[PDB]
Amino acid sequence: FNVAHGLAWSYYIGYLRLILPELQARIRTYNQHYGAVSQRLYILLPLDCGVPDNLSMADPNIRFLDKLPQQDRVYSNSIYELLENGQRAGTCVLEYATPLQTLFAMSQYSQAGFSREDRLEQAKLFCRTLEDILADAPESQNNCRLIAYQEPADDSSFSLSQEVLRHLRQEEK
Amino acid sequence: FNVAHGLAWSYYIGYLRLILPELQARIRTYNQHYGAVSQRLYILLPLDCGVPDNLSMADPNIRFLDKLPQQDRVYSNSIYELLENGQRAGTCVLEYATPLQTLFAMSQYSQAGFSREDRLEQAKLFCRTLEDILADAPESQNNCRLIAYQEPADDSSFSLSQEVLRHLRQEEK
């Protein structure tokens, strides 16, 4: 019923609690060897549940730089540069919360019992649950940040790059 | 609340519907190049939710042979030989339904709201939901089999190898 609760816990249990303890060392290794990449995993949480199929960002101000190197479990995490009026303004490890894509897909399948008009409610519950987990989680040692956003309801202009930079600059301050 | 419903759908959406369409070709490639391996993914569903941490089977009659070869998404799937009274009796691709491990872990976390005594009920619901999904799923073209089992309640002897062989021999017949 409250499907997003279980998905948040699973996402923590089966992914975040495994990848997050080794992230800082992977980033410090990249910053030593291969314009420093910021220390946290930035997790994009579009409340419209729109995650591109290729996991690629359409915003040309969010430009793919490189894969993080590894620490039988291969983790593909991407480093992006954030541009603002033509200028490199930040560099971070960025990815979508893929369980939101699962909410979207469930809403499309007749036998999932997941109404199309419940995506927003479930997305918000996913965000709330995940933020509550991360607040009491030992593997989160200042190494992920949740970026939840809804684009304007009138379909006015939205900048995902500006959304991310606001969060990065809060961590600067 | 009915947490296992969402986990079954996620397991289908984010794993089974991606890996199952390419499985037959990976197996046929193995059977050509590298005692033929059976055609289906055998998915172990222990209703006690006991999935080993290393994903390794304690039963010495289930003996690791090899990894399936690949078809930025690396899938590690293991081929096992099934022994019966010292004899190679079958060969298949075998793995645990890892969302059952997630049910177990949720039951241990105070803030998950998942009672310890609800594991069996949720495991059964996971199995029921997953079997219902797979019955109407286009990517399941006769290429996975669910093996759900509960060991005797009095802690008498249980053979996981015999459990798997029964299913393999039904596919022979």
Ligand SMILES: CCc1nc(C)oc1C(=O)Nc1nc2cc(C(N)=O)cnc2n1C/C=C/Cn1c(NC(=O)c2oc(C)nc2CC)nc2cc(C(N)=O)cc(OCCCO)c21
């Ligand atoms: C499984 C934890 C989970 N819970 C929810 C609701 O969301 C997730 C989540 O997002 N996890 C996840 N995200 C990742 C990103 C990367 C990365 N960026 O590299 C790498 N790994 C990630 N992972 C762990 C697994 C993902 C899919 N996957 C599953 N999935 C489930 O078990 C599962 O259970 C439930 C309830 N839902 C799911 C699907 C998400 N089993 C797999 C077995 C093998 C294998 N045999 O090797 C390989 C697999 O994937 C390889 C390609 C990865 O892109 C497997």
